[PDB]
Amino acid sequence: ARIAGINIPDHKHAVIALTSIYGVGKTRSKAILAAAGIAEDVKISELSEGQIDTLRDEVAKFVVEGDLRREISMSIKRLMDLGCYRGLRHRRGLPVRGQRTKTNARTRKGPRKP
Amino acid sequence: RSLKKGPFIDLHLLKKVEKAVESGDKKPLRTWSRRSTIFPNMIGLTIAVHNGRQHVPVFVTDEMVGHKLGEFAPTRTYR
Amino acid sequence: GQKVHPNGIRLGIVKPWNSTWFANTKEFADNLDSDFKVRQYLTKELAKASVSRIVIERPAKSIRVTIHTARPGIVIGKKGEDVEKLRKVVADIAGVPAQINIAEVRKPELDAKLVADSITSQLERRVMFRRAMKRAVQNAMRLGAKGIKVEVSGRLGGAEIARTEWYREGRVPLHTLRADIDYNTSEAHTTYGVIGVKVWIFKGEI
Amino acid sequence: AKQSMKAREVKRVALADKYFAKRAELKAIISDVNARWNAVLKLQTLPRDSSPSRQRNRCRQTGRPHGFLRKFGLSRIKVREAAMRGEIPGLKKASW
Amino acid sequence: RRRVIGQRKILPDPKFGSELLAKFVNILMVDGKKSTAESIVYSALETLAQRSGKSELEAFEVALENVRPTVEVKSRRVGGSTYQVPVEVRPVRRNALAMRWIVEAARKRGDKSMALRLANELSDAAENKGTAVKKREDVHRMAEANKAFA
Amino acid sequence: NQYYGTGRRKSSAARVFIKPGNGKIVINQRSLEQYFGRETARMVVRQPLELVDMVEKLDLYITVKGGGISGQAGAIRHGITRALMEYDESLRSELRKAGFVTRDARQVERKKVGLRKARRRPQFSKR
Amino acid sequence: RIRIRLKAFDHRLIDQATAEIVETAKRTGAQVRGPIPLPTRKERFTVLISPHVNKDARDQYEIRTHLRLVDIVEPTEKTVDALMRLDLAAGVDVQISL
RNA sequence: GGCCGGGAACUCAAAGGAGACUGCCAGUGAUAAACUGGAGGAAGGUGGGGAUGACGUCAAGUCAUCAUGGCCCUUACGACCAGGGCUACACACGUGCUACAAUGGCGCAUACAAAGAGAAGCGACCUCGCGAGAGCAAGCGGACCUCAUAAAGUGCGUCGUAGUCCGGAUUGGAGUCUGCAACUCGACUCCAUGAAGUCGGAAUCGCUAGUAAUCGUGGAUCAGAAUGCCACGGUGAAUACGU
């Protein structure tokens, strides 16, 4: 059924659909399927079990959907949720990249808060 | 983290990495160099970062390897 | 400010120049800087010469700068000293074995700088601004310059009033491209602020 | 004003030759990946107030940094009077 | 105002040799896209023949008579007071507004592509629907009923 | 013989050569369907070519570089008209009546600073 | 092949520059094919007037500096023997360039 | 490949010109002026654009560009140097850009420009980097070397509107170069990131032919760090009856 976690694809181009995976992404979808040796414009409904077996092994060497977002998470508080400037921007939700922290960076902090 | 090769530190402490590290550690260092990274071989050593008034301290570990100082030292008194 | 300088916008006509020469990128800038060193230290030191213009030509490593002056006998110096000593000045202040040249200005009434020098020379003379102003106007008219509108900068009188002097005389067709108007101004550092003068001699056509 | 400021870099470039023009290139081969000895890089640190990145692009009449031009490097403000009076050859008001 | 300008002279259709069809692609141009419109509207018009199933050189108007406008609001604030005053259509707008009545609902209809989405609405007028049709349904209401102020 | 016309339309510059017969059109050493083959502007140049007779009597060994889709075509659609003038000096009326004689001098704006596209005023709605 | 440059500015100088050399740099030996243009090169300026909130001005200033192509491909002595007998047209070089 | 010769016919190019000037047929119209219909010629009534802002005009702004009266202090409201900050946020606004896709995306084949810049430079080429760029490097003093290939575009399968392969924030990881050193306050690349937003109300503004609309291209400013700004091209409509 489900290979390794979230974002199960259906009826979409193999690379285009594998972008829905969060383990792989915009271009890890094509890079990992390059190691899969399958067609690309074919739908996920066109996929069979004989090719997805070569995915559980290569998602083990790669970052899995469920984990990827967790080891990135506490690694922040592992090293950089101290008095670190960026961590000051994580516990508060502000950008770390040094741009204008008032507005035009709305998505980083959240919705408008008048 | 902006070099990835040939990591260099300013002599606000590099003058003393050969002179103060040899003495173990002293009172927090009169350090105006928040710019460099801390190498992992300064465990626990007190580098007092000049936030602008004077030099403020930071707590140091060894999972600390290639991270910067000024990061660990806030500059602005928010609110 | 809507009064562009008429000479440069008419420079595409016989309007003369004061630094015309050639260079590649490796030596425009220093040569331009060398041109200012000779451009500035030949004016402050040369207040009494009544210089109309100093023109820079740079043929090859030994330049032929010419100087437009009013009185031929006064610019000689003490009989050739300024010819040599200022060439000594330029030999290093410009970095080339330069050759100086001096050009006369016939009828200095015909030069907008030199007349503006003349009024400015007598502005600090502690005189009143109207009578002396109009007196010089016809002097050129008796000697030509078929049209000049005369302007004096602000700060007239002991009061905050800083006004202009429009005072048109003759034909000065500024918007007409075929006008070849002779324009240069002059200013005087007064004991109260800045007092200047602007004059537009009309030297016929072509 | 600020002639001292306008002369500040005049003495923060007078040392560049003896420090960068004749020594930094010797350490520059280490600086670029040509072997990155950390210890050997300390040598360039001897000068501080000189640097290739420390050019102030100082206009040589009024000392404003802003308004440079790599061909000459003068402010846009003083070239104007240089324009009509002819001090810069080959220039006339650009009517195209 | 007092002066007038003549209508800009237009070369005919580069494919059918008919100036009226050439003018049609010129109104849909947003983002400067006729070459895309070549794969959008020219690909649409090529399909308009067989989908209609007849020669779209003069049968092209068999769906346009109802679209004929008669009046539109002209803002005459005569003497400083805005009035209804609908002036009857003059030829330089009654045909321009005909093209202005076409793609108002044909950008993001949620279909394959507007390479052929526009190729859905055209036969609808000679199949009695589409955007150009109901345009004339609202014009009749604003005029012909307010004689006390029309 | 070979029949010469400079031609230029909207900063486009070709060199158009007509020879009697030899209908095939050589454009930058490329075929009609190769270089100007079925694009947005591939019959927009030959409207002046149905009023006159068909392909079989004229050759176009064309020296064309520079221009866009309609630009490289613009240097041709005007380049052909100047290079067929010496072909026949009497048919000038028909193309002038059709307007193809007159050069399309609709030169694009040489931009002026300030306004965004040199004649379009930016968005500062409140005054 | 040797290609010559004629570094001048204006019609008042480039006009005689391209003809006084063709008459003198091709007497008998050189293969000067007449005055070849080498079209001029132009650079433009973006100049502001008074330093203030007003970025409005942005004046324009252009430089039309031209070059010619006398192009003495033949290293003939007499063609360059008379090169030193004239001194007008101050800033111009006979660049013997490939 | 037009490669060398070679023609410079000739694209292109440039030192000079001419060509549109109410010039003419005809008419409206006092005949006049003006206007109009028509003709000629590439160019019909300033052909097309810029340069050029009268008198005046506002204590306009500018002593923070400079100069500049008066007011200051001169071991100093002078200065050197080192950190930071001009980008910090609790929000509002001004401007621009990016989208919100299938007029688009993917990759494949395809032809598609101009202007410029530069021997302290682009950097040819050659190897790898998914790339950043790096190791090698011609050439040129630039109608001779690079940037730099155009790009949308078309045909090919493609999803048929999917908060979407849209979009790109975003984050941290991995790295490239710039500069000693770049968290604050370098860029760039790769990876994950796929958010809001699926065309925006009250409303409001811009718009006259190559116009809008666009598509990109570079340049200057540049140790470096454009959605800013300069410059160039690619495609290309309607509106303008009316006071």
DSSP states along chain C: -----HHHHTTTTT---SEEE---GGGHHHHHHHHHHHHHTTTGGGSTT-EEEEEEEESSSS---EEEES-HHHHTTTTSHHHHHHHHHHHHHTSS----EEEE-SSGGG-HHHHHHHHHHHHTTT--TTHHHHHHHHHHHHT--S---EEE-S--SSSS---------S---SS-STT-EEEEEEEEE-SSSEEEEEEEEE----
Query: Cα dihedral angle (D3, D7, D9, D14), rounded to 10 degrees?
Result: 180
The tally of domains found in chain F comes to 1
Query: Nearest residue to H154 (CA, C1')?
Result: F39
Cβ pair G48, G57 in contact under 8 A: yes
Query: Nearest residue to H52 (CA, C1')?
Result: C175
CA distances from E126 to E48, E51, E133 (A): 12, 12, 9
Q: Please give the biggest Cα pair distance in chain F.
A: 67
Q: Where are the domains of chain E?
A: 19-142
Query: Nearest residue to H117 (CA, C1')?
Result: G43
Report the distance separating Cα D64 and Cα D87, nearest Å: 21
Report the distance separating Cα D96 and Cα F113, nearest Å: 13
Orientation of helix C131-142 relative to helix C112-123, angle to 10°: 150
Report the distance separating Cα B5 and Cα A102, nearest Å: 35
Measured between beta carbons, the chain E residues lying within 8 angstroms of F44 are: 11, 14
User: Closest by alpha carbon to E102, among E10, E46, E47, E26?
Assistant: E26
Q: Sheet of F14-20: strands edge to edge?
A: F3-5, F14-20, F58-64, F25-27
- For residue E96, the surrounding DSSP H or E stretch is helix E96-100
Number of other CB atoms surrounding residue G53 within 10 Å: 5
Q: What are the counts of helices (DSSP H) followed by strands (DSSP E) for chain A?
A: 6, 0
Orientation of helix A28-36 relative to helix A49-61, angle to 10°: 120
What residue in C sits closest to G7 (Cα-Cα)?
C22
**Residue F114 contacts G where some CB pair is shorter than 8 Å:** yes
Report the distance separating Cα C169 and Cα C103, nearest Å: 29
User: Closest by alpha carbon to F61, among F112, F125, F14, F108?
Assistant: F14
How far is the first Cα of chain C from the last one, in angstroms, to the nearest whole number?
29
Structure tokens at C148: 């000049």
Structure tokens at E21: 């069809």
- CA neighbours closer than 13 Å in the CB half-sphere of residue C41: 16
Structure tokens at E60: 């092209």
Report the distance separating Cα C115 and Cα C152, nearest Å: 13
Number of other CB atoms surrounding residue A32 within 10 Å: 21
CA distances from C189 to B21, C64, C121, C184, E113 (A): 65, 33, 11, 17, 76
* Residues near F121 by beta carbon (within 8 Å), at least 6 away in sequence: F115
Q: Is A14 exposed, middle or buried (0-12, 13-18, 19+ CB in 10 A)?
A: buried
Domain region containing F29:
1-127
User: Closest by alpha carbon to A42, among A31, A54, A51?
Assistant: A51
Report the distance separating Cα F67 and Cα F71, nearest Å: 4
* Residues near A82 by beta carbon (within 8 Å), at least 6 away in sequence: B58, B59, B72
Query: Cα dihedral angle (E27, E31, E36, E42), rounded to 10 degrees?
Result: -10
* Method for this entry: cryo-EM
Cβ pair E77, E83 in contact under 8 A: yes
DSSP characters over F5-67: E--BSSS-BEEEEEEES---EEETTB-HHHHSSSSTTSSTT-GGGTSS--GGGEEEEEEE-S-
Report the distance separating Cα B23 and Cα E107, nearest Å: 75
Report the distance separating Cα D7 and Cα C6, nearest Å: 37
Q: Which nucleotides of H are covered by protein (CB under 7 A)?
A: 1-2, 5, 8-16, 40-43, 47-57, 59, 61-62, 64-70, 78-85, 87-96, 101-105, 111-120, 130, 134-135, 140-144, 150-155, 157-162, 165, 168-187, 190-196, 198, 203-215, 219-224, 229-243
Residue A63: DSSP 8-state: P
- For residue E140, the surrounding DSSP H or E stretch is helix E135-142
Report the distance separating Cα G22 and Cα G20, nearest Å: 6
Structure tokens at C72: 């031929």
Structure tokens at G19: 């003809």
How far is the first Cα of chain G from the last one, in angstroms, to the nearest whole number?
6
Cβ pair E13, E56 in contact under 8 A: no
Report the distance separating Cα D70 and Cα D66, nearest Å: 12
The residue written with tokens 């009046």 in the block is E71
Query: Nearest residue to H16 (CA, C1')?
Result: G15
Main-chain phi, psi angles of F19, to 5 degrees: -125, 145
Report the distance separating Cα C81 and Cα E18, nearest Å: 88
- Chain G: touching chains (3 or more CB pairs < 8 Å): C, D, F
Cβ pair A32, A63 in contact under 8 A: no
* Residues near A78 by beta carbon (within 8 Å), at least 6 away in sequence: B63
Report the distance separating Cα F92 and Cα F99, nearest Å: 10
Q: Residue E113: helix, strand or coil by DSSP?
A: coil
CB contact under 8 A, A83 and B67: no
Q: Is the CB of B35 under 7 A from strand H?
A: yes
The tally of domains found in chain B comes to 1
CATH architecture for residues E19-142: Orthogonal Bundle (1.10)
Cβ pair B10, B35 in contact under 8 A: yes
What residue in G sits closest to F114 (Cα-Cα)?
G56
Structure tokens at F118: 């040199």
Cβ pair F98, F30 in contact under 8 A: no
CA distances from C23 to C32, C59, G64 (A): 10, 10, 14
How far is the first Cα of chain D from the last one, in angstroms, to the nearest whole number?
38
DSSP characters over B8-76: ---HHHHHHHTTTSTT---SSEEE---SSBPPTT-TT--EEEE-SSSEEP----SS-SS-BHHHHS--S
Task: Give nearest nucleotide to F101 (CA–C1').
Answer: H42
Resolution (A): 3.0
E37: region left, alpha or beta (phi > 0 left; psi from -120 to 50 alpha)? alpha
Orientation of helix C81-93 relative to helix C28-40, angle to 10°: 150
Report the distance separating Cα C70 and Cα C80, nearest Å: 17
Q: Three-state SS across G6-67? A: CCECCHHHHHHHHHHHHHHCCCCCCCCCCCCCCCCEEEEEEECCCCCCCCCCCEEEEEEEEC
Contacts 24+ apart (CB under 8 A), B15-23: B17/B42, B20/B45, B21/B45
- For residue F4, the surrounding DSSP H or E stretch is strand F3-5
Report the distance separating Cα G64 and Cα G43, nearest Å: 7
CA distances from F6 to D79, F3, F53, F70 (A): 43, 10, 22, 17
> In C 96-155, which Cβ lie closer than 7 Å to strand H?
none
Measured between beta carbons, the chain B residues lying within 8 angstroms of A78 are: 63
Structure tokens at A90: 């994580």
Radius of gyration (C-alpha) of chain A in whole angstroms: 18
**Residue F113 contacts G where some CB pair is shorter than 8 Å:** yes
Q: Which of F9, F40, F47 to mutate to test the interface with E (most CBs of E within 10 A)?
A: F40
Report the distance separating Cα B29 and Cα C191, nearest Å: 58
Report the distance separating Cα G27 and Cα G48, nearest Å: 51
Cβ pair G61, D91 in contact under 8 A: yes
Q: Is the CB of A21 under 7 A from strand H?
A: yes
- Judging by DSSP bridges, how do beta strands F58-64 and F14-20 pair with one another? antiparallel
Structure tokens at C24: 């590649």
What residue in G sits closest to C64 (Cα-Cα)?
G90
